[PDB]
């Protein structure tokens, strides 16, 4: 699996939170970013 699939759950949580927030998502972003930056595809 690539990094985007490994980190997909965190992307979904961010989008779900952005969607709530438009009717602060800083943690949901920090989590995704962490997962992306620590993922090594190879």
């Amino acid at each position: 699996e690539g990094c985007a699939s490994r980190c997909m759950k965190y992307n979904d949580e961010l989008e779900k939170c952005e969607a709530r927030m438009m009717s602060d998502c800083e943690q949901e972003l920090e989590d995704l970013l962490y997962c992306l930056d620590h993922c090594h595809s190879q």
Binding site: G2, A4, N11, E26, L29, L36, H40, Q42
Partner: protein, 619 residues
Amino acid sequence: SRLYWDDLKRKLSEKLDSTDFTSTIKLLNENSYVPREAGSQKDENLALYVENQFREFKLSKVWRDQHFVKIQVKDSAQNSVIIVDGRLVYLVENPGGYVAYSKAATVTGKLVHANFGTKKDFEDLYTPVNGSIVIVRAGKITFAEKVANAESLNAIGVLIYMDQTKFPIVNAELSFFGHAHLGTGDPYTPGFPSGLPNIPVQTISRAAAEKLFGNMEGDCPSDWKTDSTCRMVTSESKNVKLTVSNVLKEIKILNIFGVIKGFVEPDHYVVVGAQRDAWGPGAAKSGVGTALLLKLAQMFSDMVLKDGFQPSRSIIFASWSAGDFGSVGATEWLEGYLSSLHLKAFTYINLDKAVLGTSNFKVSASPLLYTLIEKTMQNVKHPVTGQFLYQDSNWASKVEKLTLDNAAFPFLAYSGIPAVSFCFCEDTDYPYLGTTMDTYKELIERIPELNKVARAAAEVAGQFVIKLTHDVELNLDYERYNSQLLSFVRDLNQYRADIKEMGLSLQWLYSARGDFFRATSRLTTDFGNAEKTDRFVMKKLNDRVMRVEYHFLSPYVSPKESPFRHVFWGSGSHTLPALLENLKLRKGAFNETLFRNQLALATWTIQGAANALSGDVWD
């Protein structure tokens, strides 16, 4: 026997072990090839030498690419720096070097020190620089940026020198060269038979600077960490007169090319390049790169003809001229293939200044190349310690972006081709760059294991090439842009309240980020599922990956007005950092009209990059 990565890696390493890089560097310091300013007889002699070597190596094809370009050079009248004390006037120096693209002019006024000439350096001075000449230290930023920063504050000229603390050179009288174009390529020549300075700018020796400081008052701040002789402002009784008379001259430059054709997809290429020209002897500046280029071409050609290496894609070796003037030779080549080069060349590897020391290994690149760099670091040893280069798993979050003086910059920011530059270096700058002391003698004295360090720089570049050309798949890491986009959205998200106040919403930018995310995932899945032996499936997928970098070039600006169109790595009001720099002002230097357009155009560019990652229209 079909060769696999392990076999190729071990073959390269074998060939490198017997390679003599220092003999070639030394040959390029012989009298027939120094000095070698662009368009000179000696530059040309070296070009034709490189050409004939490429032929000797039996490359698939070898060719010349010529351009006529206008450079600036010294006039027959000497440039000068003079102290005016009226009742007396005396010469400080007739400098041996110059700064190309200086305005030709004579100015007189106060002299004011501005440290390195950064924007913050100027902000912290107690003396307004308007209507004054400014003196700055070389370093930290380019000459072009120093001049632009001074001009922005209405300075009337700029002097540039090398202080002993940052540039510990025994000879205080040493001259030096650079250029002050805030761009690349030839800024002059119209489209029938621009980042230029409107003030004079001139390099002076340390000795000259010290004579100036003897006419100046005020200690320099200790946090500048410069010499004790440095002073801040001319005395009231004294002014400085700078006279620059540089002239334009048309020259013919030759870029020399050689290719090893790919066995499967010869129409796609990795391009490996090095600057050939230099003011003065240019050992570190041009010699080392050119030596690397020669040895890499020879070794790869031998691997193909003798050892069974069958690269799927082509490998192009490029010896550029007029690099010293702002990557002019390389830029002119790029410009000939506006809009289409990214469909052919999929990566650029710069070899310039790859060996400046031993302590550190540094790399700057498009994020598309980060996985390739990481895997390469895992497989190359440091040339002094013996440790593998990969000793920081968080390296990629620390990389600095390519700068305007690096020949890899226009490939990425203008042409949309993923590019990489790397070096073994120190924390300190190499002191002799741009001087007559940039010789093989000085280089070998500072780095007595120059041959082993050059071997390591060759191994890095060689491994990049093999990885990029061996398999049916392209080793380009498009998913690395998910982190880059997310990081931007994080920076933008600090101004959420400003954005609400203006009646705007980030929904469509968020949504475009998510679209790119899912679109990279889908492309990765498709690679995973593809029949790797089907040359037709793989060519289609790889063609897609080759367009990823290009789709981050803004389609909304002219490359004649803003050549550096890449929204991450480029320059001007269409970049993502520029959007943040404007929005930062709202706490009327802030322009709301500009910001609205910037948000719209960024969002359209990111969304269009996501859509472009889909295969067919019905997907």
